[PDB]
């Protein structure tokens, strides 16, 4: 029954409309949902705008009038210039009239702010179409009407605010460059008269609602108006004094002054400098006397969250940091300004204590600006001694966990600067802090962790002697703290912090072997501790110390009979006995870091052999009993043992890279045989159980083996220095092991990792195995494309790796695509375009890059048959497919690379890089240039794709576009202008002459 309003053959029943609207906004459930579908259908009727004057006059429902204005908005922003001129004048007169009568009725003005604001916005859409060329008296009459009514005057401030926003803040995306400049110049041309009204209202009082609306509009003006309006009038005085006293105006005024601080100002005028000092001075004065003194506990105030206090303190932080980042030098030389300077910074100190992450980041950014300057700028740091001292405590006490990551690094940077500015004070604060952890007056898990991170973060700032004394005191004190606490929970926390600090001071460890050795032996002890987190902590600290101190493990230390790396390897079974597989791998990886420091090849290989002794023995055992009874591989235990062996090899190879080669050679051939055996079992399982088999633990275990084997090979080849060996020993066995298996498995059984592995092979040695690359394409190209060309969702990993593989092949071995049969090369082109249409960023970017690289590859071939045929077959396919994604509004993330590709394609023609004609000898006269034919093809293409464009628009667009095809920034601008114009009717073709 509600669907009656959708019947336009009859009159519109306003009572029925209001019911549908009420049911949507105030109703619920199924009825609400139904009304929603009706209203949307109503609103999207292209004739609904005609029934808008009816609603705005005879409705008693504000939501209905709002919806009516939304219908008008669509019409004004998209189809305005198509209307008969009388409808345009009618719609305009109706909107103006409706706004006036709403403002005159105090009841409506008070209770319908939403409907009035919508009407104002609608008026502004008309202005963007009609003003000033067809409405030159708008501003003069606005200023006139303002004097006759406070309500109209206030509403005019809202209208101007929205106008300024639409013209200066939000025009870049929504209108053409020419249209935007036209409106900006028009506003700028009449702003003198606008400001006069604005300033008079501010100076003469008194309605705060009117004052606030005027200040709201001022905030928008400050984005673009010349500085003279602010500095050559008395308005700064009003902002920084009068309006900071009233809380109603205080919030908006503060935002205005923040923007004033960003105005474009001459830096050589002493009077202006005085004006900039003065408004700051006035503002801080008002805060101290009307809001809170500098001693106030802002942390507590913010936490209480009364009224608008949180927003105010946020806005005060923004004001103070913005002004001081730009102007604090104005306050630094004059002794009479010192108190002001330090009071402003003391407010920031207090603001910095607030528990609010995002606000802390804002203040922290400022502190960084400050202490960096004090670190470099002569004669400045003594000024801020007491500020910096307080800041040290604030940062130390709010240190976050290292490794969010971003905030810790920012804290570290500021605290390192503060430590350089005064090492003695930093040390004292930290030792003091540490004592209050020992006497328990500030003891907690959070407080000891925070202090430890802080102590760790300033590593490298002290002298080595001071650092030595410092590290000793801290570890001594922390060790005492650890013994003091009972229960594994407390001891775990302190022990972790102790290990964290030593790990942060490698310089200390490197200079004191006996101590480093003690630290490492202690970690080995902790690798037997079953308490949650300890083993992880022990392993992470181990590899972290090794990364920084590896040299001291590989050389023979004084008073030692051997390099400590030998000692670690001898006892490795015992050390790692209680660790989980992941943690063992980390341990072996850490050992690989050390072994790679040994540059005697014979010794390095011996160490490598000894390190891999346990996995190699386990390996040899399995390879023997694996090839004896392949049923073993169905034993989940054997599968897990095998995966972990391979993972151990990946871990060590990750550390050793090129050096890992002898170990790879130990297992390589049997490993690929294992790969084949596992592959058969997966196939057999899928045959006997169906696709569901791929979900079972057994098959997932088997596929893990294959994936880790591929990862190992990938990891080595990506780091290999001897590519002769890669090509002549590794590649052929690899390809024969993996390619046919991939091709001849059903889609759900194919490992995307194969593609990833092949991408690395082509990347490093592709140029040396052209036959190999062809073999790769044959085995994976068509069958993978068929997996991913039915939608954008299935096989997401195969999708991504596929285009990465094509990308590197197109870069390193383009010859391989030349060998493709014509039908297969056609699929290659189809695949690239298919990549364009993805929203998936991974796929889209590679799709566009391949297209670009492909065109360049074809170009480099010169005037030859394959290049000529390529352009005949695929040039306009690439042009039109690129245009499609450029203009369909669903691929905006790719705009830049689409533009680049398009520009490249067009430039080929206007440089005569395409020798043969792109047209049929029938469809165009003999001797016609490709340049002429290109313009024809494109004009026809755009005309059919965008039939609401005039021939003139299309012709002007293409004229501009092609002539700008050597200027990417300008070219891109013309495309953006085009994307605007296709959204509406009657766009100005002269817009394309902007550049």
């Amino acid at each position: 029954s509600m669907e009656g309003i959708l019947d336009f053959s009859n009159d519109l029943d306003i009572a029925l409309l209001d019911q549908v609207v009420s049911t949507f906004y105030q109703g619920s459930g199924v009825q609400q949902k139904q009304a929603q579908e009706i209203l949307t259908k109503f609103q999207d009727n292209p004739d609904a705008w005609q029934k808008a004057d009816q609603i705005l006059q005879f409705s008693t429902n504000p939501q209905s009038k709002f919806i009516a204005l939304s219908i008008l908005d669509k019409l004004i922003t998209r189809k305005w210039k198509l209307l008969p001129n009388d409808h345009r004048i009618g719609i305009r007169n109706f909107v103006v009239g409706m706004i006036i009568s709403m403002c005159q009725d105090d009841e409506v003005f008070k209770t319908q702010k939403n409907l009035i604001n919508k009407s104002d916005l609608t008026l502004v859409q008309i202005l963007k179409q009609e003003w000033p060329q067809n409405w030159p008296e708008f501003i003069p009459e606005l200023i006139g009407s303002s004097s006759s009514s406070v309500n109209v005057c206030e509403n005019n401030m809202i209208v101007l605010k929205l106008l300024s926003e639409e013209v200066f803040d939000f025009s870049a995306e929504q209108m053409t460059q020419a249209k935007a400049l036209h409106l900006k110049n028009s506003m700028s041309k009449e702003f003198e008269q606008i400001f006069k009204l604005c300033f008079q209202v501010l100076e003469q009082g008194s309605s705060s609602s009117l004052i606030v609306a005027t200040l709201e509009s001022l905030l928008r003006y400050l984005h673009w108006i010349p500085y003279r309006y602010i500095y050559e009038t008395n308005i700064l005085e009003l902002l920084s004094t009068k309006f900071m006293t009233s809380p109603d105006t205080r919030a908006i005024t503060l935002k205005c002054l923040t923007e004033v601080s960003n105005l474009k100002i001459p830096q050589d005028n002493d009077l202006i400098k005085r004006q900039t000092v003065l408004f700051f001075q006035n503002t801080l004065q008002q805060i101290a006397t009307s809001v809170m003194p500098v001693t106030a506990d802002l942390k507590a105030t913010y936490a209480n969250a009364n009224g608008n206090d949180q927003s105010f303190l946020q806005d005060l932080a923004m004001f103070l940091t913005t002004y001081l980042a730009r102007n604090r030098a104005l306050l630094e030389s004059d002794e009479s300004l010192r108190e002001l300077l330090l009071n402003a910074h003391q407010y920031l100190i207090q603001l910095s204590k607030i528990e609010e992450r995002e606000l802390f980041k804002t203040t922290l950014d400022y502190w960084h600006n400050l202490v960096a300057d004090l670190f470099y700028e002569p004669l400045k740091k003594h000024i801020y001694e007491e500020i910096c001292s307080q800041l040290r405590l604030v940062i130390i006490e709010n240190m976050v966990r290292p490794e969010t990551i971003q905030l810790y690094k920012s804290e570290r940077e500021v605290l390192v600067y503060l430590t350089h500015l005064n090492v003695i004070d930093t040390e004292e604060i930290m030792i003091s802090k540490l004592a209050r952890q020992i006497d328990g007056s500030e003891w907690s898990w959070h407080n000891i962790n925070t202090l430890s991170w802080a102590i760790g973060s300033i590593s490298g700032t002290m002298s080595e002697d001071t650092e030595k004394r410092f590290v000793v005191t801290v570890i001594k004190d922390l060790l005492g703290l650890c013994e003091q606490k009972r229960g594994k929970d407390n001891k775990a926390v302190v022990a972790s912090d102790i290990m964290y600090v030593v790990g942060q001071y490698p310089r200390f460890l490197k200079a004191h072997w006996n101590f480093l050795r003690t630290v490492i032996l202690k970690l080995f002890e902790f690798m037997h501790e079953t308490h949650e987190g300890v083993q992880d902590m022990a392993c992470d600290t181990f590899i972290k110390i090794v990364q920084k101190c590896k040299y001291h493990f590989v050389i023979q230390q004084p008073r030692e009979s051997e390099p400590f790396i030998q000692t670690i390897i001898r006892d490795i079974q015992k050390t790692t006995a209680d660790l989980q597989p992941q943690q063992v791998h980390t341990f072996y990886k850490a050992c690989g870091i050390i072994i790679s420091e040994e540059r005697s090849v014979a010794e390095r290989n011996r160490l490598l052999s000894d390190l891999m002794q346990l996995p190699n023995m386990a390996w040899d055992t399995i390879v023997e009993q694996s090839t004896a009874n392949p049923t073993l591989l169905l034993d989940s235990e054997t599968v897990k043992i095998i995966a972990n062996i391979i993972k151990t090899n990946v871990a060590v190879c990750t550390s050793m890279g090129a050096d890992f080669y002898p170990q790879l050679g130990h297992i390589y051939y049997n490993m690929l045989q294992l790969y084949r055996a596992v592959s058969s079992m997966i196939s057999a399982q899928v045959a006997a159980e169906g696709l569901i088999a791929t979900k079972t633990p057994k098959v997932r275990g088997l596929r893990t083996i294959k994936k880790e084997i591929l990862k190992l090979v990938e990891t080595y080849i990506s780091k290999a220095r001897n590519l002769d060996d890669v090509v002549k020993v590794l590649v052929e066995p690899l390809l024969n092991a993996v390619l046919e298996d991939y091709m001849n498995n059903v889609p759900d059984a194919r490992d995307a990792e194969v593609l990833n592995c092949m991408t690395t092979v082509v990347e490093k040695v592709g140029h040396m195995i052209p036959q190999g690359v062809i073999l790769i394409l044959q085995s994976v190209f068509e069958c993978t494309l068929d997996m991913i060309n039915k939608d954008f969702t299935e096989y997401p990993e195969h999708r991504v790796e596929f285009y990465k593989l094509l990308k590197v092949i197109n870069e390193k071995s383009f010859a391989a695509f030349l060998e493709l049969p014509p039908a297969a090369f056609k699929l290659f082109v189809d695949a690239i375009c298919w990549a364009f249409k993805h929203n998936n960023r991974d796929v889209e970017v590679n799709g566009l890059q391949i297209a670009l690289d492909l065109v360049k590859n074809i170009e480099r071939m010169g005037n030859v048959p394959f290049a000529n045929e390529f352009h005949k077959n695929y040039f306009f396919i690439f042009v039109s497919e690129t245009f499609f994604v450029l203009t369909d509004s669903d691929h905006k993330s790719g705009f830049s690379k689409q533009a680049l590709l398009l520009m490249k394609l067009i430039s080929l023609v206007y440089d005569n890089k395409i020798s043969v004609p792109l047209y049929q000898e029938a469809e165009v006269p003999q001797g016609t240039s490709n340049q002429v034919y290109l313009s024809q093809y494109l004009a026809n293409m755009l005309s059919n794709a965008f039939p609401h464009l005039t021939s003139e628009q299309i012709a002007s667009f293409l004229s501009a576009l092609t002539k700008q095809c050597k200027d990417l920034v300008v070219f891109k601008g013309t495309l953006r202008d085009f994307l605007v114009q296709i959204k509406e009717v009657g766009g100005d073709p002269t817009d394309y002459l902007f550049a």
């Binding site: 570890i475 060790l479 101590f515 003690t518």
Partner: peptide, 16 residues
Amino acid sequence: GKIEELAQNFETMEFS
């Protein structure tokens, strides 16, 4: 000197 004492001290750290 006091670092060898620190090492000795570090060795005595245990959970139980």
